[PDB]
Chain length 266, copies 6
């Protein structure tokens, strides 16, 4: 009742009765820049969310901008050595890898700037919902530096290796329907991206926990290997998930016609 949401500071957490937890970056006056303290909180939260029973996460940023990326001021002031910063990057990965492979569905509800490490963070979620104020960029080059948080991997998977290279090499900005179509977000709304993210999250939370776990962890792992080896692994995932007792009621519903068929959109 407070076990999941207590003890944090840079993050604000709200656990709903159906197991959907709203995780809000809460440093709006700094445009939710990710400093080392905030990254450690993300590591802590995503390291235990699955075992804590969280069914889905709606990730958002307080204020008008999702996330401005690496806290550039903390970085500049720290005057870090290469090894000091390499270690900081490894902490980002511990958090973001836990998000991607952890097994808990994450839906990012975007607004305003989703830039640099902020796009890296949005990319670590399974689904992204953008609104009319949302824009994307990897402006790192302007600051004289490289990106991080696995953006070189995830954004390449989202929009194509060559478009990812274009974004960081030129600082090109994308927004609106063009951004959605490019692959920066699966959903675009005329209204509240938060409300749309909550709708998706609630539906996800009503599905089977094991099935969601597999979807949210196995697919990313299988992209990392040869498709011929991935197929063998997929068969074992299917073996466990498809024979689970909890799905028999749904299988029976299909056989007795009480369950809905798959129809084209209206």
């Amino acid at each position: 009742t407070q076990d999941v949401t207590s003890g944090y500071s840079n993050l604000d957490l709200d656990l709903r009765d159906n197991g959907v937890c709203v995780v809000t970056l809460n440093r709006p006056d700094k445009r939710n820049a990710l400093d080392v303290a905030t990254i450690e909180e993300l590591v802590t939260f995503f390291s235990t969310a699955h075992r804590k029973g969280v069914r889905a996460v709606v990730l958002t940023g307080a204020g008008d901008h999702f996330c401005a990326g690496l806290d550039l001021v903390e970085h500049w002031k720290a005057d870090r050595s290469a090894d000091d910063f390499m270690h900081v990057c490894l902490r980002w990965h511990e958090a973001f890898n836990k998000m991607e492979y952890g097994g808990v569905p994450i839906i990012a509800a975007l607004r305003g700037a989703v830039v640099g490490g902020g796009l890296a963070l949005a990319s670590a979620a399974h689904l992204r919902v953008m609104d009319q104020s949302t824009y994307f960029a990897l402006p790192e080059g302007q600051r004289g530096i490289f990106t991080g948080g696995g953006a070189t991997i995830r954004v390449s998977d989202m929009i194509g290796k060559y478009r990812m290279i274009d974004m960081i090499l030129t600082g090109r900005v994308y927004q609106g329907q063009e951004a959605a179509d490019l692959g920066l977000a699966q959903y675009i709304t005329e209204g509240s991206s938060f409300d749309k993210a909550m709708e998706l999250a609630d539906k996800i939370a009503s599905n089977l926990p094991l099935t969601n776990f597999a979807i949210c962890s196995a697919i990313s792992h299988m992209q990392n290997m040869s498709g011929l080896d991935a197929a063998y692994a997929e068969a074992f995932v299917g073996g466990i998930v498809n024979t689970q007792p909890a799905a028999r009621e749904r299988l029976e519903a299909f056989a007795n016609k009480t369950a809905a068929r798959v129809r084209p959109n209206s």
Copy 2:
């Protein structure tokens, strides 16, 4: 004259004089659901199609719907153990991997529902032709289960890892021009997808057998490795294919101007 098309039951096969074989899933009253028997026939057919001389395959489903996926009723009734079903999934892979890496051009002529394992099957073909009635989905989650047939691999290659995840996580349906543009099918027609698939197949069958074999097997293998190692392999594929005696007539046609040049579309 009957060697290629005899001995089957769930599949109907029609071998045309130019070596194009039409393979039709033939359980329309069950919406061509893939039960274990049907999968074994696909294993048998694609395991020997290249050596039998088949030049191209037009894969289609009898009735109004291409394929409804895993036979859910057989699955539910069998009340399978995890290992029993893992083994069933391996049979699906034997068939679908033979389709993808086998070297025989496969063009799927889609109509209606292309869902779950049915999309997995369509994804195992090189080319997909959709019509105005065609719609796509990975509704597995609704049934409480995971997908199979390598859909996590192939559909991710077709539309992007994150869109593949979106489809199975949310049950999102795609159709029409939007589906084509997303990458679910390379061709969309206002008319008969079968006639369009046959047109593509006939043109393919008129090209060189070795060249088609390489195109239909080597490209998928090269995506499975580092691009630096793939390049070395590509050079050996090019070495064998590009120096084949059968292509010299075409090379000569280009040199003497009797062959057509590459021009923009009209």
Copy 3:
């Protein structure tokens, strides 16, 4: 002052004062077909461009067509053995791999035909700028042969494995906005693709050399491995690039508000 641009023949080279070097395929009467001599010049140029101080490359073709691909006449006449041609393909890779992983930003300014090995060459650049006369194809099958220059890898990364297969299997041609949207080029202009490429190149040359080097070499390498291992490598790239002394002035500019913020497009 002539060290970078002297000693070539099939290539014309022009080094601008800001370190941008214009590399022009110069066999317009042969539509810039890539024969073995031209490939060796590309090997020589891209093998040393980074150490020579070249900041960006604008790659283009003299005449109305970017590049017609493999010199088919030289190939036909040579009546090569499989090993002879496999060796020729390895020379293409030495050049194109040096382009992709070499660390020097390359922007291709396309016009007319970008076909077969010509698309392979355009694909080896980081950015592609197309104009209204530009069209793309992998017509190799028509000539009875396979593609090369890593097109099976790079074009698959650009437009999707299945669209790459479609292009070579059917000889399908793409042009205009449709080509740009498919992923064949990140930029499309109503005017001069060369002028647009120069604008991009000049901006790129004004960024930090180490940062550009990382962007132009590390991202391609990281796509070749599992994302979990790639993340560790990304942290070391970030460690070196993000703590470089040359970027502190830019970081300071952001902290004191003298640097521009990231805003949506107008």
Copy 4:
């Protein structure tokens, strides 16, 4: 007859506990592997698991396990590069079905295990050699690059650089030195066939699924980054270790 009939170049003997002895049977040609024999290996190893075979003891009739690819057939066929590339894919189909098929294969070696014969031996999970057994890739000296995935499997057995040494120089290994190198896990002073049968009978008394996973998943996981193989392994362990037959054995 369902398991043993249908082969001309292979001799099969199915034992009552499910161990099937598969004997290469062209002793007059030292069991050289021609396209027809390769196709029989494709057929046998594609169906053995589903036909109920619990383990296979693979041996060569005569004093020599296998003299390699049939060079007489190769020379007579005068194959083009593409014709031979296709022949190589058939060799891989047979050997891949052996390695990833899930049916434990124990090779009982004797005499020459050379060229494609070493590729065949390497496709088994276990190898038992005797005091007459020797290994080599002699074809390199005559301009041939060994096929059957020997470059893949022998590198895993003895190390990439020792594999390069064998094909580049034709170096021969035998006796205890070969066993210690990694060419065979078992070396006997007596019958390699009898030792292989001892191993096969014990393996056949274990659970079908457990042997299936051991004989297919490990090879697949070795092709992956260890960080992704870990995840796949959890699902393999999840299915194998909670099977009812295993619980009974714990009890």
Copy 5:
């Protein structure tokens, strides 16, 4: 207390030079690894680097290093396939943090290093065995497929085919033969604990960053094509070899 308190199944002793002795402490159950012990290993190895631990000497209390996965707990829990798949992921979390965590781990082995116990030992960078130490994956005979990534790490240690042999037959290795096979880099006639401490003290006197790279980057690079690992290595070398502390040592 910041480093040593917080564990029930592990006994910890932090030495003044930063070497931390981590002792598996359920001697009465031969240090069988139950879910609770695995979670403690996850916690310790997730934080050791940031807590300042310079090297770890891992040992088992009693005469036996580790008897493997706790089969008593497994049998009693009567786990479903998904329940056990989740347990396996926890084992991987602990062992992956050990292998890629960047803190040098030296295992001081004694007696039985079996099943999941061999998986644990393999997760260390270095292993020191004594004259009583033996290695085996006996669980296969009772229908169990070894977890903890043993199929991954033991294949790197002794070769894929020797690893397949161990799990398929339950074959036991000990003494000099085991060391030569690759099961342990060091074998002693005396105390394996004292030899491990000697190794750990020397390692602890080296630079933190250099040890960190050695103990995380090599495993990551082995998961890549050598052509891409080369590029990553250049950046590792770039950071490690230009550190101020290293320059001082050159001088």
Copy 6:
């Protein structure tokens, strides 16, 4: 002069059968590898195949093969992390051209084969050691992480965990123990140079293409999943095994 001139730190001797002796020639500095020497290795190994070199015997002038990276130059240059990362990429360019270049390289070792010197030796296909030869990665003790892809190649030669042991502890190997470990395929009681020449002359008498494939494809296939390497191998076999020169040899 086309093959042998153009180098200052290397001494070259092209024999009539195409074997080229490449001698590291800074004996006064124990052949330490400075940036200039590395660039010469890049040049030689980038062109050897196309210049017609049939095989290379690589040795170090003096009693020691190679003392490693030139630490004097490193200390004086006071390199930044990016400066040194770039130096590392040059080392990889040279060693990658050696490993995948397709020209057989046989290293004749003597004395110290240490640090970057072991990385260089590992870049050859074959290594011949004598009774004075020893191997070590001593730089780790002074805070340096070995470059030149030693973590990649030495892991393939002796196993990832033995490679980690060498860099983490500075452990030295020599004599028969080093050969058995996998540091060298050949050990001689006499001249390692003469034994390397014997090997090189035999290799040079084989077909150019066959040696080219052996010396480039095997390393590339080891970077792939075995299931995809199989397919690539079929095309390598298709081209190599149907060459006219090979047919003649069969006949």
